[PDB]
Ligand SMILES: CCOC(=O)CC[C@H](C[C@@H]1CCNC1=O)NC(=O)[C@H](CC=C(C)C)CC(=O)[C@@H](NC(=O)[C@H](CO)NC(=O)OC(C)(C)C)C(C)C
């Protein structure tokens with residue numbers, strides 16, 4: 001009956017974390033086989049932060065401009081290139097700890113685990129969601145850049161995020177492992193701000209299914225709703241519109257619990273309009289939107 | 302400005318997880334050097350669950366009564382004993398992945414990370430606190446017994462918890478690595494229930510210090526309080542009484558923020574009496590009690 005935000009076990013990723021230094025700038029990098037990936041802004045310095053030309057800044061560097069440390073062991077850079085907002089450093093050794101892996105670009109609403117690292121040393125792990133506004137409500141201090149986000153399924157590590165910056169509101173922005181930014185953000189210290197965010201409707205619904213599979217039915221009601229009537233309440237409470245694709249995704253959870261999706265949507269509409277009055281769902285006093293339908297299945301095994 | 306419940310990176314512990322089978326009962330064990338630790342109730346069967354004599358049940362077993370798997374690799378049991386509610390299985394190989402480690406018995410209020418495991422395979426990690434009532438609000442499905450809780454400080458793993466049971470309310474009970482139970486619980490399927498729980502005052506206060514170190518001061522006030530006057534509001538709202546030791550522990554955070562402890566206690570008393578009215582502290586709509594003063598320092602590095 002207990003229900004937590006669970007992170008994937010971080011071992012396979014810990015073994016890939018390294019420190020990358022260029023001048024007086026140190027940050028984290030990801031060491032897979034004989035390549036080290038890291039934010040290209042390692043190459044920036046004090047002044048050229050508001051307006052960096054990365055092409056110009058990189059042509060002035062050599063393979064020994066980059067110092068790369070796995071543990072206290074040093075690795076030799078034997079070649080380098082820039083791919084979008086990432087550096088790709090070729091090194092003399094293949095990481096003997098390289099897991100089976102892939103690079104994936106996740107979509108908003110999807111969740112992943114972040115291994116927060118400082119100077120190439122893993123310090124903490126937590127579960128995150130890609131917000132509709134392409135930021136993450138993470139926890140990153142000075143020296144956290146190059147920390148990665150990932151999912152794991154049977155020993156295959158899907159990398160999906162690398163950390164680059166904190167925005168003024170305190171939220172975090174970064175790239176896939178290609179690394180193209182998620183969202184309209186750039187790796188220069190300018191006036192960029194997160195757009196307005198929305199609650200992830202599909203996840204709230206998934207999580208209400210989890211509450212029922214877990215035994216609790218108090219919020220359910222005798223009513224139903226149409227998609228369009230739901231989306232009017234959604235629009236007022238700043239929830240993403242529900243689509244037919246979302247309704248289909250909720251199929252398996254709907255069948256398992258015997259509660260129709262639009263009936264669950266009626267239940268949610270009632271929770272939105274009437275509040276929760278002193279009560280909790282799966283331990284929470286708020287409607288949780290950072291568990292996907294896939295997360296619900298796995299944790300309600 | 303973002304603030305998450307962070308778990309320790311789980312790698313060092315993943316490498317120690319194994320599967321232990323005895324009859325038709327499989328669960329997890331912890332493999333350190335040439336010893337495998339696991340809940341003694343691996344040796345129980347269908348009927349003898351409500352009333353097991355573990356001494357009687359164990360004398361009837363031999364070293365080959367126990368099947369132990371690290372990965373798919375098998376390990377040979379070459380001796381065995383029972384220590385309190387744990388089995389200690391001696392095996393032919395020392396775990397080549399044994400981290401530097403210790404066994405610690407934690408106190409209520411303290412926090413730790415749990416690596417939830419199924420059949421010797423790590424599946425998720427999350428941060429937990431030992432509740433005042435000696436249970437944990439964890440997340441454990443069938444097959445999770447033998448999962449461990451731990452802290453890590455510079456590559457030393459302090460093991461503090463091993464999972465044994467779920468209580469009727471959905472909360473979890475287990476032992477230290479000696480393994481004496483935390484709380485008045487026993488490893489037999491009887492009528493045991495968690496006692497009434499309390500909010501961990503020291504942690505709420507620590508977390509209010511974190512909110513200020515993180516920039517937010519809205520809940521602060523011009524008032525102060527005495528320890529005794531605070532403990533009267535505490536008693537009504539089911540918070541642990543504050544002691545002088547707790548006031549001393551909050552010393553460093555008090556000095557760093559320039560807010561006196563009893564002034565913070567005045568702020569908390571005001572939050573308890575007036576609610577939070579639509580506002581949030583470090584992202585939360587509730588007063589968080591699962592971050593210790595030590596947790597606050599580390600995550601506000
Ligand atoms: C040790 C040196 O190497 C690193 O690891 C850097 C890690 C931190 C990530 C930070 C640390 C705190 N939270 C984070 O996520 N990233 C950065 O500082 C980024 C590096 C970007 C470059 C060099 C072009 C820049 C930022 O995150 C900075 N953020 C901004 O400039 C944001 C977005 O552009 N803008 C912003 O805050 O608005 C102003 C400029 C009007 C005040 C903050 C530190 C103020």
Ligand SMILES: CCOC(=O)CC[C@H](C[C@@H]1CCNC1=O)NC(=O)[C@H](CC=C(C)C)CC(=O)[C@@H](NC(=O)[C@H](CO)NC(=O)OC(C)(C)C)C(C)C
Nearest residue numbers: 328342441442443444445446465466467469488489490491
């Ligand atoms: C695969 C077989 O091996 C395992 O891994 C066992 C792991 C689970 C842990 C469970 C699973 C769900 N949540 C958990 O934490 N532990 C157990 O089932 C425990 C094994 C104890 C023995 C054999 C003496 C027993 C329990 O946790 C059981 N709990 C109780 O009996 C609790 C506390 O005594 N009592 C209780 O619920 O009240 C009743 C008896 C009046 C209904 C539940 C499964 C019902």
